[PDB]
Design an enzyme around this catalytic site. Structure first.
Site: not given
Ligand SMILES: NC(=O)c1ccc[n+]([C@@H]2O[C@H](COP(=O)([O-])OP(=O)(O)OC[C@H]3O[C@@H](n4cnc5c(N)ncnc54)[C@H](OP(=O)(O)O)[C@@H]3O)[C@@H](O)[C@H]2O)c1
Ligand SMILES: NC(=O)c1ccc[n+]([C@@H]2O[C@H](COP(=O)([O-])OP(=O)(O)OC[C@H]3O[C@@H](n4cnc5c(N)ncnc54)[C@H](OP(=O)(O)O)[C@@H]3O)[C@@H](O)[C@H]2O)c1
Ligand SMILES: NC(=O)c1ccc[n+]([C@@H]2O[C@H](COP(=O)([O-])OP(=O)(O)OC[C@H]3O[C@@H](n4cnc5c(N)ncnc54)[C@H](OP(=O)(O)O)[C@@H]3O)[C@@H](O)[C@H]2O)c1
Ligand SMILES: NC(=O)c1ccc[n+]([C@@H]2O[C@H](COP(=O)([O-])OP(=O)(O)OC[C@H]3O[C@@H](n4cnc5c(N)ncnc54)[C@H](OP(=O)(O)O)[C@@H]3O)[C@@H](O)[C@H]2O)c1
Lengths: 249, 249, 249, 249
Positions: A49, A116, A143, A153, A159-161
């Site tokens: 793919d 996507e 956030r 497609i 999106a699935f992931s």
């Molecule tokens: N959810 C995500 O996609 C994502 C991604 C990366 C990191 N994080 C979290 O953020 C922490 C470190 O942050 P960073 O410096 O990257 O960003 P950050 O800006 O310090 O934190 C992002 C958010 O997470 C909140 N938070 C931290 N610990 C928490 C807890 N255990 N329970 C509920 N909320 C909590 C923070 O609270 P306050 O606003 O009160 O400071 C803030 O709103 C990591 O330990 C991880 O847990 C989350």
């Molecule tokens: N799921 C995730 O966390 C993740 C993260 C980034 C990107 N992707 C997907 O991978 C695509 C591009 O890949 P890349 O170069 O970063 O990595 P990639 O190695 O080319 O692809 C990663 C995996 O996604 C599969 N794939 C691609 N299109 C698909 C479809 N629409 N339905 C089901 N499976 C599909 C690939 O199939 P084959 O092994 O047959 O080549 C491969 O197994 C993006 O368009 C995105 O959809 C997924």
């Protein structure tokens, strides 16, 4: 007719050359995609793919693609290396075709995506604050690690992931879904592909089909383009969807 | 023109009557919906989405419905009791209409569903083994409390609670989703509403829009009927969708 | 020593009898479990997890149970019919024991649950409003098909189907999780099994381990009992957990 | 007694100085964390949860922290700027303390994490292939954006966003959960914190508490350390958990 055979490894290339010869098709061999692939009546893709995605990145107007799957699931492919000669012959003799929309995004004007556009944090483990608008209306602000705007497609890709629904290939739509949304409640949203999607995020990178990418800040518009992906009609595509999906890994 | 006012409780019924009367519309009040509602130019419902689902269950041909939300989120309503007057005048004057498809299932061929057909275990706390086919392909078989076949309008109801996606009201499709699936992996499937859905299960009930139900054993088919639900055009329908969903509780 | 063999179908029952007999154990066969099973040194069950749940419902003091898996995943079993002999000899010779806590609820004070207490709508297709308190703090109120209060052992059963986490068998806790919650955000909550759980709901049933149930209206309390389930030590329990979960279906 | 007051902005710093003075506590002011903060009887943190995480990164042995929340949810904080003077006085006079385990990881020996260690792709939109072992047993192998090993305190952080369960602060455990797992089925796993976790991934970055990070390839071991986070006892911590969680954004 003249066909391009695009391959990643050359395991089965000789047999493909011989099949196309028995079919009176002229063959040009490529081991990397290029825009020169627009100059062909059809394209045979050997790989998975991902290989089709990379080929598609080089095509504006798209000659019909026949995919031979050495990859894994092969949602975009038509045959395996064991059954390809029968399937290729049927595909070229019938020459029925199928089209799936590709979308563009304003941060990369000449790039097209089948699966996507993804808008991600430039830095891993860093959230971005994403605002989503559709046809001018504010739909959400979340956030998250990133945010996906997929076609149907793409519903089986990233999106699935992220937790999105499986949508069948012949139902045209967008799937709008966050990656690691830091919020108590959230849902994927499925909307008509005739709508204009706007994503606003600071300190982001935008990525089309996992291939082309650029850093951006602020507003990006994603919309359906006039340049679809074109494949030979796979008459079992809907049937095969559900088994293939359950095998994903 | 003549209108039916259907309510559950005597809300702003005298007021609503007065507003219709100043629009030169004749009124008859209904404490409960009946098939008699077909003999009206339009229907004003006073209640929630649930009231509108009960009106509709008595209609084949559907006079356009104007909904005044006394319930909760009111994805099917047009106004509040604190603003109905103005949207109501606006609606009857323009008389612009909007249709959403309904489905029927073979277990109850005469009953139509706007939201979903649900297939549940006849006994609570017991699983049933549900086999799903779509235009004749076996798409899945899964042990579960039940299984939902919803329209896009139903994506915000029982399907939503089972973990389904939010689909905008103008993208026509089925959402196919289990309730409490006992399996390691599962996804909701979104398919074209042009397709025929077949559900097979023993020791089961079938329910349409939460309202009518019957016991069944064996195969049922669900498909799109020719009698859609007809409402007055809600111009803010799509933009309103998003905040109403987030308010769901 | 004397052993009870409890089976649903006459599996490898003559063989199992012969193996016990060569270990100098006396045997009595049971087509159905009864309170008579307390008058044995140990119990061999021939069936699935469901059979073991039914044995246990007849036991306060629990002789240690050895499970031979004829069912499915057999998270509570010790061996297969194709290998029982060897693990069975090994088990009676070492006689090493393992305990998992059971819970009871006030609606049925005399019935114990290893997996979960589930509170469901008495009528399928109807939601109930469930209020949850834990050691007296109001933790949530939510409209749903039902609500599950599970132990860690029950995290792979009904709770798993509702979307719950897999908790290893040696981490003692409650998982609190709704079935088909009608709300935009929700999470499962994992709390100490030392805490008292209070569930309040009207027009409901309560079910223990899928087996015994009664109608209730109002408050019930669930708490840890003094009579745990006793099995022979399964040394591969934790390592086996992971593959068995992925096989769930 | 000598306390350190660590602040991000100086809005309320004067009032905090005056409160600690009325309490006969000596005050040192810091606007960035440093290891010098080990030399105090207690630490007053003005800011949010993130501010406490950054302070904690500078402490091996941890003086008790009292958090004043100007941030948002404040799961780690004890008071707001409106009620702090009453709460601070009660906290210092009683001087009751509470401890929560921190974990280490072998790729960053002297770093400690309260919330989680996260193992991510070095490149956004790139999956890594992650193998998970626990006490030597192979538990899973999944392609994903990243993989989280959180404590119960971290259950409301990144793990929450990835789809994990809310676990109460006083139930010691690990939550093992992938970010954007590309697989049909998956589940979070909750295991005892006395176990050793091993994560193997090529081309990764490891991140403790969103703060300190290093690129690595291959095997990393995560285990409970001997150096917990120490806070003044917040007697409503369990009660406040469920409201705070529902407010997350
Ligand atoms: N959810 C995500 O996609 C994502 C991604 C990366 C990191 N994080 C979290 O953020 C922490 C470190 O942050 P960073 O410096 O990257 O960003 P950050 O800006 O310090 O934190 C992002 C958010 O997470 C909140 N938070 C931290 N610990 C928490 C807890 N255990 N329970 C509920 N909320 C909590 C923070 O609270 P306050 O606003 O009160 O400071 C803030 O709103 C990591 O330990 C991880 O847990 C989350
Ligand atoms: N799921 C995730 O966390 C993740 C993260 C980034 C990107 N992707 C997907 O991978 C695509 C591009 O890949 P890349 O170069 O970063 O990595 P990639 O190695 O080319 O692809 C990663 C995996 O996604 C599969 N794939 C691609 N299109 C698909 C479809 N629409 N339905 C089901 N499976 C599909 C690939 O199939 P084959 O092994 O047959 O080549 C491969 O197994 C993006 O368009 C995105 O959809 C997924
Ligand atoms: N989620 C679940 O666990 C579950 C279980 C059974 C039924 N239902 C839903 O309830 C509907 C009617 O069944 P019933 O008579 O048993 O319950 P009901 O009490 O008549 O309605 C159930 C709740 O769902 C709301 N609702 C109805 N249609 C909706 C829509 N499509 N989008 C968002 N919310 C909607 C209603 O809104 P109002 O308050 O404004 O009336 C009401 O609060 C069914 O068609 C089904 O969609 C859900
Ligand atoms: N998931 C759902 O939609 C749902 C609904 C009702 C009940 N249940 C579960 O079924 C149990 C017994 O209820 P029942 O008599 O109605 O059904 P059952 O037929 O006796 O058992 C239901 C299925 O669940 C398996 N099972 C039982 N305990 C398990 C455990 N803790 N971990 C993983 N799988 C387990 C059984 O395994 P075997 O095949 O080896 O017997 C059987 O396949 C309940 O305690 C509940 O945990 C689940």
């Amino acid at each position: 007719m003249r066909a391009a055979v695009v391959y990643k490894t050359d395991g089965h290339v000789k047999r493909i050359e011989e099949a196309l010869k028995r079919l009176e098709v002229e063959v040009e061999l490529f081991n990397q995609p290029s825009e020169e692939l627009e100059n062909f009546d059809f394209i045979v893709s050997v790989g998975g793919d991902g290989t089709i995605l990379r080929i598609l990145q080089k095509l504006k107007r798209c000659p019909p693609i026949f995919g031979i799957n050495t990859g894994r699931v092969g949602l975009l492919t038509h045959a395996s290396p064991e059954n390809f000669e029968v399937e290729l012959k049927k595909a070229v003799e019938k020459f029925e075709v199928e089209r799936f929309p590709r979308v563009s995004c304003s941060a990369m004007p000449d790039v097209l995506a089948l699966n996507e556009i993804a808008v991600l944090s430039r830095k891993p483990a860093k959230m971005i604050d994403v605002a989503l608008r559709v046809d001018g209306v504010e739909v959400d602000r979340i956030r998250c690690d990133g945010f996906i705007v997929a076609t149907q497609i793409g519903s089986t890709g990233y999106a699935f992931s992220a937790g999105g629904p499986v949508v069948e290939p012949y139902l045209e739509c967008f799937i709008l879904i966050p990656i690691a949304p830091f919020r108590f409640g959230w849902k994927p949203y499925v909307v008509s592909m005739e709508r204009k999607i706007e994503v606003i995020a600071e300190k982001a990178i935008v990525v089309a089909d996992g291939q082309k990418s650029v850093d951006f800040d602020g507003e990006i518009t994603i919309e359906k383009s006039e340049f679809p992906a074109v494949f030979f009609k796979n008459e079992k595509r809907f049937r095969n969807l559900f088994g293939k999906v359950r095998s994903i890994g």
